[PDB]
């Protein structure tokens, strides 16, 4: 009865965790912010339109100077744009057409891309030759690659469909650390603005907070009903917001180990595809399947400042570091900049 | 125009050349024939690939009658199909392979599950998907010599309880083909092509060509109005 005893102990520990989480709840966030005046109506205009992709668009990322962009499409192309004059700075052809993610180095010297070939490719932008070369190919995963984010010019972290995440040292090309524990496919991850921890969301409707230097799972969060498609992280470092396939978004807090609010509406019965915050964390922007993306007040959970103007599903959206513009892409092969 | 410096003008010219190159590649990329390959485990698809003179996704190329064919085999991906199938939404056709002589073999740890019923379930799931509502299927039936040799002592009633016919190769093969084609739930927007493969039957590549031609013509009849 050793297996039965171990399962019973696991259930007892789960019940203890639930009891610990029950006694810490006093008042929902909508009660502490009942005296906050609403932000009113928010309207944005399209300032630029970026054209040139000839298929669906799956990822984009902002540079730290708030001036340059990189975007990936399934025509086999990675494009770096200047967003003030709508000029093209670089165009890079990939080896495998089925790309699914992008990352841009925080210094500005490197880009990364991966997809349905179980490989992460790293490209060098600043050479003595005038062209862009392939700097590194990282292999060792067994299922498709769904996200990747630099930490510096030497270390990267990736997530795959194996249920495993990995931390790699670029110079040698070897897996420095592996993070295991999810049951289903991992679809997204979001670093923290100190590169000390990170979060991951999986198809088993769960999220996990991991420590990077130790290399082990630190916390877990549940509550959704279906798989999680996108995850973001609050600016101050103590919260994060998730978006699942339930037509719901949610906010979780690390220190209280609870759930804070849910953002959903009765007229929306589609799935979310991407979320992001704003510089002061007062506007949560989320893309949807209805061909348009919505804007939510983040402290009162009541707004939809629709950014209509796309003809297909919104794949990706992002906000600059200074915070003046917002970019969206979609399956109709157009990017749009709003403020 | 007149408010630009020399360096800005050089940047504009560079962007324009990049645009032209992108456009040329995009025009070239739209005259290829993209086929998606499917078929349950150990169903002769390897022999099919071998005959026509050809981890992650595996991709194969060839050229027939001045046409460029690219075949995609994604058999190694052990994940859930509802996460990567929409990436193949705009393919020209789906090739499907099954084996005729697997109607009396045990598939899984349970002896009840035979292979032909699993292949029928897979075909049903592919045919009536929501991302393939007007994509055509080309169906290959393999190992016909072995089936003909086996039916002498093995009756087809072992797998189809309601079969009330003779025990000859022709009628059994026709019954199997009909039982497969009777699963198309979208009979007006979709068409199904069926073939009986053979070792010396090189025609099984020509057959593919023929089907593709029809598909192309139909698509043209939707560009120039008329549909």
């Amino acid at each position, epitope marked *: 009865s050793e297996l039965d005893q171990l399962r019973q102990e696991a259930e007892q520990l789960k019940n203890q965790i639930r009891d610990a989480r029950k006694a810490c709840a006093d008042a929902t966030l909508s009660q502490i912010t009942n005296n906050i005046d609403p932000v009113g109506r928010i309207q944005m205009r399209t300032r630029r339109t970026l054209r040139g992709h000839l298929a669906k668009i799956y990822a984009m990322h902002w540079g730290t100077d708030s001036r340059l962009l990189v975007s990936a499409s399934q025509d086999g192309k990675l494009i770096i744009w200047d967003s003030y004059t709508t000029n093209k700075v670089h165009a890079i052809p990939l080896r495998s057409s089925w790309v699914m993610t992008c990352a841009y180095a925080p210094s500005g010297n490197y880009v990364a891309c991966g997809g349905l070939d179980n490989i992460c490719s790293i490209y060098n932008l600043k050479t003595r030759e005038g062209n862009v070369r392939v700097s590194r190919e990282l292999a060792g995963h067994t299922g498709y690659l769904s996200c990747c984010r630099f930490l510096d010019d030497n270390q990267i972290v990736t997530s795959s469909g194996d249920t495993t995440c990995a931390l790699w040292d670029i110079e040698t090309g070897q897996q420095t650390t592996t993070f295991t524990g999810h049951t289903g496919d991992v679809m997204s991850l979001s670093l923290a603005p100190d590169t000390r921890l990170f979060v991951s969301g999986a198809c088993d409707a769960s999220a996990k907070l991991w420590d990077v230097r130790e290399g082990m799972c630190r916390q877990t969060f549940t509550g959704h009903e279906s798989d999680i498609n996108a995850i973001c992280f609050f600016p101050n470092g103590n919260a994060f917001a998730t978006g699942s396939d339930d037509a719901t978004c949610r906010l979780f807090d690390l220190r209280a180990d609870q759930e804070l609010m849910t953002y959903s509406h009765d007229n929306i019965i589609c799935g979310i595809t991407s979320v992001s915050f704003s510089k002061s964390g007062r506007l949560l922007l989320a893309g949807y399947d209805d061909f348009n993306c919505n804007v939510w007040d983040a402290l009162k959970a009541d707004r939809a400042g629709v950014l209509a103007g796309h003809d297909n599903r919104v794949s990706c959206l992002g906000v600059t570091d200074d915070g003046m513009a917002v970019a969206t892409g979609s399956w109709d092969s157009f990017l749009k900049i709003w403020n | 125009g007149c408010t630009l410096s*020399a360096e800005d003008k050089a940047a504009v*010219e*560079r962007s324009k050349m990049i645009d032209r190159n992108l456009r040329e590649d995009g025009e070239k990329a739209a005259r290829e024939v993209k086929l998606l390959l499917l078929g349950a485990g150990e169903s002769g698809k390897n022999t099919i690939v071998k005959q026509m003179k050809i981890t992650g996704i595996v991709e194969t190329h060839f050229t027939f009658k001045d046409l460029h064919f690219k075949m995609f085999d994604v058999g190694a991906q052990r994940s859930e199909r509802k996460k990567w199938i929409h990436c193949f939404e705009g393919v020209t056709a789906i090739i499907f392979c099954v084996a005729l002589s697997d109607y009396d073999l045990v598939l899984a740890e349970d002896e009840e599950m035979n292979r032909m019923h699993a292949s029928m379930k897979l075909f049903d799931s592919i045919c009536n998907n929501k991302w393939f509502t007007d994509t055509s299927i080309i169906l290959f039936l393999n190992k016909k010599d072995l089936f003909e040799e086996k039916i002498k002592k093995s009756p087809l009633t072992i797998c189809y309880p309601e079969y009330a016919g003779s025990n000859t190769y022709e009628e059994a093969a026709a019954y199997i083909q009909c039982q497969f084609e009777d699963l198309n739930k979208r009979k007006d927007t979709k068409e199904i092509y069926t073939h009986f493969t053979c070792s010396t039957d090189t025609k099984n590549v020509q057959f593919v060509f023929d089907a593709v031609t029809d598909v192309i013509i139909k698509n043209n009849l939707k560009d120039c109005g008329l549909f």
Partner: single-chain antibody
Amino acid sequence: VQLVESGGGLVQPGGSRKLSCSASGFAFSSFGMHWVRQAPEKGLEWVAYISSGSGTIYYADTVKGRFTISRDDPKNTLFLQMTSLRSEDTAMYYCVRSIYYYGSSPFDFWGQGTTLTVSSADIVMTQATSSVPVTPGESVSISCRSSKSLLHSNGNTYLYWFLQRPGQSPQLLIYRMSNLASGVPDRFSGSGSGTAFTLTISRLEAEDVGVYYCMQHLEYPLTFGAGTKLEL
């Protein structure tokens, strides 16, 4: 990266000649090119410009109509053709590489030059000094001046600083008045404000003495200074 020029020699008055430049070690078809000239004992003088894609060509006021510039991309070669050569065409010519996109460094690699011996809305640049005596370990400051304002409306300031050592070819030091080139010690600096600009050196060493030039790139034609010969 390697540019090699050829075609120089002795030419009698009138006549004609053709100079060529062969490139190796970089993507030659993504770069625009310039031909520049230096008199036997005077400063630098710009000659001609061609761009990437051959969709733009520029000449200088004293050469236009007599010179012709062309490029051959499959073979990676650059050509200049000169006809009706006068006595003011005795100098040393250099081929210069340049690339323009947001954030690039133009005028970064210079050739080795070849010699040729023959038997007004332009901006004026003024090198206020001609020689400076210094000792190693000290600090030095040089300044030059313009006539118009080099600062554009988008925020840039197009001023360049080059060094030429004895027996060598120029070597880019600073582009756009404050940006240090790649492969240069951090003891050099540039600063200034409209119409007056200053280069600064700290803690001199040997092999750090030569002639400094300041150039503008606000509009064509491009105009050089006269040069300051720092001495030790």
